[PDB]
Design a protein around this ligand. Structure first.
Ligand code: HEC
Ligand code: HEC
Ligand SMILES: C=CCCCCCCCCCO[C@@H]1O[C@H](CO)[C@@H](O[C@H]2O[C@H](CO)[C@@H](O)[C@H](O)[C@H]2O)[C@H](O)[C@H]1O
Ligand SMILES: C=CCCCCCCCCCO[C@@H]1O[C@H](CO)[C@@H](O[C@H]2O[C@H](CO)[C@@H](O)[C@H](O)[C@H]2O)[C@H](O)[C@H]1O
Lengths: 106, 103
């Protein structure tokens, strides 16, 4: 987590972020919020855009390090991603499903 | 465990992509007959993503319950969907700009 290239910088952010984010001061919102000064300004706190209620469980402002963890799997925090392919949040639900599945599949 | 509530969970949450009876067809996901006590990625007639190659398990109730807390994280490309980058020297490459363009 030190430095990096700038020319692939514009490319990588254009390859993987431009579709959902702008950055320049006063930039428009997209499907995702504009990122002007994402440091200092607390996380999930861009005016003109209210977030999913995931910002309420995890919200410590990003830095050079702990944000890099967010770009490993940002979808982990987007709501409905668990449920998509059969995710069950409640353990009693997983218990009941596994109870049924053990007998139905054998 | 209520198998009665489990049946209803499977009907509304899993049946859209899986069958469970012996000889059942594959759908978007594989037929689940015999899943317990076999390894991930082994249903006959279904060809899987590469997820199970490096994440291989012998299905039991412990790892099934863990898996079912979040199956999407093993679907290849779900992490990339919202800006996931795999290799460490690529996040480090582009957060150092994210500090520049903030200014
Ligand atoms: C569309 C699929 C997106 C892509 C590609 C990327 N991001 Fe994203 N991001 C998106 C949304 C819809 C949201 C909001 C989530 C919510 O709960 O409302 C976000 C959020 C962020 C944040 C948090 C900003 C804050 O105000 O705290 C950051 C820092 C962020 N996104 C950065 C980011 C980067 C660097 C990306 C390229 C690797 C990227 N996102 C891709 C939508 C999408
Ligand atoms: C479509 C949107 C799905 C829903 C809804 C559920 N599952 Fe699924 N499942 C799906 C796919 C495409 C795959 C294969 C993934 C791959 O990497 O190829 C799977 C896999 C499973 C497995 C593993 C199968 C095996 O190893 O043979 C299990 C045990 C499983 N799925 C169970 C399951 C349950 C219990 C669900 C309801 C809670 C459920 N899945 C929903 C696609 C989809
Ligand atoms: C708009 C939405 C923005 C949502 C904000 C999410 C920001 C979180 C990014 C990672 C920073 O969070 C930091 O890493 C993980 C993620 O929970 C936490 O710990 C984690 O460790 C393990 C990983 O080895 C995980 O399995 C655990 O579930 C988690 O507790 C740390 O306690 C926290 O210090
Ligand atoms: C085919 C498509 C999907 C492929 C991707 C499958 C990914 C599922 C992985 C879910 C992680 O679940 C995890 O499985 C491991 C290994 O089996 C379990 O490990 C545990 O049971 C194993 C049984 O020998 C032993 O290693 C120990 O008892 C313990 O490590 C974890 O306690 C469980 O928390």
């Amino acid at each position: 987590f030190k430095a990096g290239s700038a020319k692939k910088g514009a490319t990588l952010f254009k390859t993987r972020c431009l579709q959902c984010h702008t950055v320049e001061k006063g930039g428009p919102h997209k499907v995702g919020p504009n990122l002007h000064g994402i440091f200092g300004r607390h996380s999930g706190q861009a005016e003109g855009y209210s977030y999913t209620d995931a910002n309420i469980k995890k919200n410590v402002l990003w830095d050079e390090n702990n944000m890099s963890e967010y770009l490993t799997n940002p979808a982990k925090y987007i709501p409905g991603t668990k449920m998509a392919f059969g995710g069950l949040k409640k353990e009693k639900d997983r218990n009941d499903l596994i109870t049924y599945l053990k007998k139905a599949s054998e």
